[PDB]
Design a protein around this ligand. Structure first.
Ligand SMILES: *[C@@H]1O[C@H](CO[C@@H]2O[C@@H](C)[C@@H](O)[C@@H](O)[C@@H]2O)[C@@H](O[C@@H]2O[C@H](CO)[C@@H](O[C@@H]3O[C@H](CO)[C@@H](O)[C@H](O[C@H]4O[C@H](CO)[C@@H](O)[C@H](O)[C@@H]4O)[C@@H]3O)[C@H](O)[C@H]2NC(C)=O)[C@H](O)[C@H]1NC(C)=O
Ligand SMILES: *[C@@H]1O[C@H](CO[C@@H]2O[C@@H](C)[C@@H](O)[C@@H](O)[C@@H]2O)[C@@H](O[C@@H]2O[C@H](CO)[C@@H](O[C@@H]3O[C@H](CO)[C@@H](O)[C@H](O[C@H]4O[C@H](CO)[C@@H](O)[C@H](O)[C@@H]4O)[C@@H]3O)[C@H](O)[C@H]2NC(C)=O)[C@H](O)[C@H]1NC(C)=O
Lengths: 307, 307
């Protein structure tokens, strides 16, 4: 069991901004009009593998000129409507019980080919956070908390960005999967982090810690899509302020991989990549009894499985 | 398929020294008398798990004062006689056909809980190298080539060091597993690398490349045992002259983990750690078609399985 000692928290108080979807609409740049999310038809390649999972080891140079090697995975999903599931921790109903569980354990319940940790959660109580829809079922309605969202609609539409409560409750072309992160990294192929800071953080003293959350290097995970509508999962190992990538670096890395929209999921010691049910990354938390590293018990999971 | 582009080769000519076991005996330090290998009764904990597999991420400082993070795995095996197998590539008979195969593919044929790449092989032809005994069966008799050896005898004796041909053909308490590496890292708890250079390399121009093989940082793997007779498997990710550890650093790392005898197995792009049949490390070779990394098709495999 992990010690939970690499905590990378975007908020010091309540999770998410306090302002409404309408506030987000009214503050976004004029280029985006009145619509606060993007849509893309998912790819639907029946004559292709379910996914391709690739390992990268790359040299990143930060602003100060310092070089660092980072390691991680990029996963490309060819038929997201059929193969992608947002899973509650442990099993259906896990969120109602404030249950936390390793990615690998949750992943095995659905024989996920690739699984990563998913959304944010209360690291003291285990409470789930954000909006959650799992295989067509509404698991958690945040009441319109304005954090970055990723969803899939019944007709295969991929959705990225900010959603109202009315949006997620829509019964026309309803969401079949939905999860929330913190920070919209890329919008229409451009870095959207400064816009995210304004949308997803209260304009208070909170912004200092939130900008640190953005600027510090750590382990990170993200989900996005490319121009063909393939879903892209991203993971990079790290440790807060010691190894890994900050969100500017993640967004640039994904942009160069031709990702068009992408959101940041949970990171730090939460970041986990699981291949066919086996841990296949280097987590940053220490195990309770040693100098060894241990995967963290987390909340929702993003699972890629056979159609 | 991997491009085989991180090659870490100890020899520029034929594999191994040209001199006999008697030569090795006659040149070793007086402290070791006339016996050129060590023995340890294997642990036999029936009331324990098969293995414990631990992840490390550690800061290494080299001679020049330069700091680097390295990542890898330490696996502890509680009943080695029952749980450890040396596997030919692909399946029994693979060496006879100069067959190469991914660790993960070979590992799945025996449902290995943990598997690593094993011995050296000819990177042009695929020919197996060293001595090989797999589950009691003599696969390859090198004819007494004096490289570092790891074996398990029928009565559970762990054997590390230099062996004659007569030693490996012994029908009293015969070897049930046997594999060869290059360099005996630790002997009786002390670093034995300089002694290994003398034993395992011809005293010719070859020593320059061999000392580079020892001194350069790269991905590395090793096998050893602790004072209780538990088998210890070691893996560290890396890339020759860019990331990872040199053999001095590996020996010191293992010595601090209370490893008493240990040999160096194949490294560079060969180094692979596989958990329950899934790749669970970051290989250094590039894939044939990309900037992505790919596991290498290698030769023998060290497999830990259920008794
Ligand atoms: C992403 O956004 C950050 C934050 O922007 C800042 O906060 C927002 C909440 C909002 O209020 C913005 O209006 C505001 O800029 C950007 O980081 C900021 O970048 C600006 C511009 O580079 C910096 O402004 C400078 O602040 C100095 C005091 O700390 C001040 O002395 C500077 O003025 C002097 O020097 C400059 C030349 O360097 C010159 O232009 C002036 O005329 C004067 O000589 C200047 O005002 C902020 O300090 C930065 N704030 C933080 C917290 O870093 C960031 O650049 C942006 N990134 C991208 C990629 O868009
Ligand atoms: C592991 O082994 C290496 C190799 O040892 C060398 O090669 C072997 C095959 C064998 O022949 C040995 O006899 C031989 O030493 C060790 O690395 C060597 O270390 C020695 C001693 O430190 C070095 O000797 C020095 O060589 C210089 C020329 O390059 C020479 O100028 C030096 O003499 C001057 O300076 C020293 C003080 O630094 C002083 O003692 C002298 O009196 C004189 O002022 C000195 O002779 C070798 O160059 C090293 N060789 C290589 C290839 O690095 C290594 O130390 C050892 N490691 C461990 C942990 O045991």
């Amino acid at each position: 069991h992990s010690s939970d000692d690499d905590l990378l928290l975007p908020y010091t108080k309540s999770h998410g901004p306090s302002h409404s979807h309408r506030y987000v609409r009214d503050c976004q740049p004029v280029a985006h009009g009145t619509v606060t999310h993007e849509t893309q038809a998912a790819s639907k390649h029946s004559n292709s593998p379910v996914l391709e999972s690739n390992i990268f080891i790359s040299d990143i140079t930060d602003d100060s000129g310092t070089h660092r090697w980072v390691s991680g995975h990029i996963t490309e999903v060819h038929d997201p409507l059929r193969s992608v599931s947002v899973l509650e921790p442990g099993g259906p109903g896990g969120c109602a019980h404030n249950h936390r569980e390793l990615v690998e354990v949750t992943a095995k319940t659905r024989k996920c080919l690739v699984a990563q940790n998913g959304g944010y959660f209360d690291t003291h109580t285990g409470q789930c956070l954000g909006n959650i829809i799992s295989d067509g079922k509404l698991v958690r309605n945040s009441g319109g908390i304005q954090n970055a969202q990723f969803g899939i609609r019944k007709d295969g539409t991929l959705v990225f960005g900010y959603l109202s409560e009315d949006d997620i409750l829509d019964q026309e072309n309803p969401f079949v999967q939905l999860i929330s992160g913190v920070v919209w990294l890329l919008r229409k192929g451009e870095i959207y982090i400064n816009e995210s800071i304004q949308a997803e953080c209260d304009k208070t003293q909170e912004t200092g810690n939130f900008r640190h959350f953005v600027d510090v290097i750590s382990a990170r995970t993200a989900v996005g899509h490319d121009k063909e509508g393939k879903l892209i999962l991203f993971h990079v190992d790290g440790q807060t302020d010691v190894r890994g990538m900050n969100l500017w670096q993640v967004a640039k890395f994904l942009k160069d991989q031709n990702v068009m929209n992408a959101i940041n999921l949970d990171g730090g010691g939460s970041a986990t990549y699981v291949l066919n049910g086996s841990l296949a990354s280097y987590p940053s938390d220490h195990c309770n009894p040693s100098k060894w590293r241990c995967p963290r018990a987390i909340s929702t999971v993003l699972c890629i499985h056979e159609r």
